Amino acid sequence: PFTNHRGETLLHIASIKGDIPSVEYLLQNGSDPNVKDHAGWTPLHEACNHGHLKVVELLLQHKALVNTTGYQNDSPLHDAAKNGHVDIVKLLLSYGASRNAVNIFGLRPVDYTDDESMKSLLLLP
Numbered sequence: 001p002f003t004n005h006r007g008e009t010l011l012h013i014a015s016i017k018g019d020i021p022s023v024e025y026l027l028q029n030g031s032d033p034n035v036k037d038h039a040g041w042t043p044l045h046e047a048c049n050h051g052h053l054k055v056v057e058l059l060l061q062h063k064a065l066v067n068t069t070g071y072q073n074d075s076p077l078h079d080a081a082k083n084g085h086v087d088i089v090k091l092l093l094s095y096g097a098s099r100n101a102v103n104i105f106g107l108r109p110v111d112y113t114d115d116e117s118m119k120s121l122l123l124l125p
Helices: 010-017 020-028 043-049 053-061 076-082 086-094 116-122
Strands: none
Touching: 010 020, 010 043, 010 053, 020 053, 043 053, 043 076, 043 086, 053 086, 076 086, 086 116
16 A cells, blocks of 8 residues: 555565565565556556566466556556567466457557567467
8 A cells, every 4th residue: 555656566666676586575475466556557567568577477476467457558468568578478478468458549569569579479370
């Protein structure tokens, strides 16, 4: 419940930073990873956007909802796809991330990449 003026918890902040010891300890001690700041971001959205694979994985192990819509209704998959984080796209998908989820613009994660390696995970062969 303790947040800064932007509604960010310590978990959000550690997830932005990719601070594994912090994320790990908070989650180990019962911090609910299903929590939004004022804008709509979950700690998972933040880790995916900033490329923090291990943090993403910890959040998922601790029951962070893989498909939650955040700011502009972006999924965690949007954030990872957007920012060219192929490893995180694979992980998210392995947890059941919705490949063709749409944000408020009606756009999919694939709509945010020209990368071949990224497109191959998000499209069918």
